[PDB]
């Protein structure tokens, strides 16, 4: 359907896992979303990386209302404000990017749509917060590491961080990030082995998602 900022933040916080998938093929995207939904995933991020990716997103967005009615769909890899506006027109419930662009914050704030900008320093986290961003994306996480989140959260306990990059659906990796204070994690390649997609092994996608979500749940 369409979910307001309150539900999106809460659902992201509670599940703690945001799959990150390409906008390649509409039919492949539907299957990945179906497999993730069955695994318990309720927030899903499409990336704006292929040509006319917003057209794939629009098709999936209209289909997902009946197919996976509790899935909250959002867009990632956004670096400019007009493209963020375009996906808001297409039904995006949250906007994520690898960097921070204040113009995007302005356009997202105008519709109370959560903007999750990429941050790579404690100052960048703070400026994003000043812009009204409730969740900041620590990116790339493998570069900054769990210690970055732990160090930031001590003087800035209000901070809520999504970690993306270098997160794995393994218990030792997930424990490290959530013990450090992460609110949710984003994952792409590690949630969908390219082998499993190519052969249509969707139950494998469901299982990895379920297992990762289960580890997050007992960590919390």
Author numbering: 5 to 224
Paper excerpt:
The structure of Bfo2294 was solved to a resolution of 2.20Å in the space group of P23 and iteratively built and refined to a corresponding Rwork of 0.179 and Rfree of 0.221. Key residues highlighted in yellow Glu 49 and Lys 141 form a zwitterionic-pair critical to the catalytic function of Bfo2294. KDP was modeled in orange as part of the co-crystal structure of a KDPGal aldolase to show the orientation of the substrate in the active site. Enzyme kinetic studies previously conducted by Eshaque et al. was successful in showing that Bfo2294 is a KDPG aldolase. As the enzyme was found to be dependent on NADH as a cofactor, the enzyme kinetic constants of Bfo2294 were determined by quantifying the decrease in concentration of NADH by measuring the decrease in absorbance at 340nm as it was consumed in the reaction. Analysis of substrate specificity and pH optimization by Eshaque et al. also showed that the preferred substrate for Bfo2294 was CSA at pH 6.5. The assay was not repeated for KHG, however through multiple sequence alignments and comparisons against structural homologs, Bfo2294 may also be capable of similarly degrading KHG.
Chondroitin sulfate A is a linear, sulfated carbohydrate linked to periodontal disease as the principal species of glycosaminoglycan appended on the surface of cortical bone of teeth and in supporting dental ligaments.
